[PDB]
Design a protein around this ligand. Sequence first.
Ligand code: HEM
Ligand SMILES: N[C@@H](Cc1c[nH]c2ccccc12)C(=O)O
Ligand SMILES: [C-]#N
Length: 381
Amino acid sequence: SKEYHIDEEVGFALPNPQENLPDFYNDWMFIAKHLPDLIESGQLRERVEKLNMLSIDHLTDHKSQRLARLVLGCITMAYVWGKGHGDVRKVLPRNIAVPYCQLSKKLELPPILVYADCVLANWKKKDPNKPLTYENMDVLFSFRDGDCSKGFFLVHLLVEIAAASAIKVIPTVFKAMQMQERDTLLKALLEIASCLEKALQVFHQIHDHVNPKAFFSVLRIYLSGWKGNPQLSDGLVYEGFWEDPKEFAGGSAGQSSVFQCFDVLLGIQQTAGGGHAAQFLQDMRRYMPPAHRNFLCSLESNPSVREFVLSKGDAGLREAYDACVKALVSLRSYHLQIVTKYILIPASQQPLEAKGTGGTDLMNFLKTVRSTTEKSLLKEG
Ligand code: HEM
Ligand SMILES: N[C@@H](Cc1c[nH]c2ccccc12)C(=O)O
Ligand SMILES: [C-]#N
């Protein structure tokens, strides 16, 4: 997975990303590192507006370009939403928007904060000699003081890392199929099941580091976007770059390649059907980095693991396949419990159906997606 850019240890996450840019972009780095203070003051909007258009040509390598997207992404969100109380801006300055739109065109991403920015690239190791764990880790950027953005983003990253153990087994599954190696295929599927079972235990940790009320009222508005959002109904206008206001979906873990990776592997056709959920999951691949878009493409091109397993009249092999599907159902069942605690209950406390940051009708969306996953269970062969 050299051309796919999937690490053995961290999977789809960017391994050890850059913390600081070259000196030419210190105007950017100063605004982004002090977003908690500059928003609370009410002087962030002016600070962005009175700032020269710095060009993008001095960002040499990929990790520099990704850190720039993160800086420019976080800044763009804090500008548009401002204090987050309702006073918004429907126009992004030409000095910030043009180089952001150019950098985003270079990396084949939309010019808006995505999962790849604020999770996969928004982290660091405290002590490099220690292991990957919450006490040894910290994010690079936050929005406000008491938004739980450290706990929020790192819990996602921890799941991505847990999934990396499963992702690295996928080449063995296809080799074992081509080579008609039944026992290897069985062991590989049981390993993937075990890794995805373990990723559920990493999910549990979100309660310890993320407060529901701090999440729903403070952080969630900055993660929101402008695709079918009433606050910016026709979209946001990027001054100088584009002519009309352009709609782009807000960030969400739907932009993660992990869950899509295993749905495709296991023949769970989420993106098939032409419904609103299928449409969303396919549309969110635009918001994944192009190497992972390519990985998911490569995965669909391979022979079906499901078809292979069903054809063989083999209880152990079916059971192993079923365990992977059960694991994905569990994670989604637990994800709905999280959604009850972190969206549903908090929204009932503030003074027809509820919209997610990605733009989905979330309760129907999520239960459709879970139901599709449930239907793929063999139910004792
Ligand atoms: C406070 C925590 C969380 C909330 C409130 C939440 C909420 C949601 C919502 C509303 C959606 C629907 C898409 C949208 O409209 O944006 C969604 C989708 C999704 N979420 Fe989360 N989520 C949370 C944490 C997580 C975590 C930790 C993961 C870890 C992998 C995750 C994985 C997903 C995935 C993969 C989808 C796409 C649908 C699917 O494949 O089942 N979410 N989430
Ligand atoms: N989609 C979630 C927000 C969210 C959850 N996990 C994320 C990861 C990255 C960006 C946004 C998110 C919501 O509507 O509340
Ligand atoms: C979760 N989006």
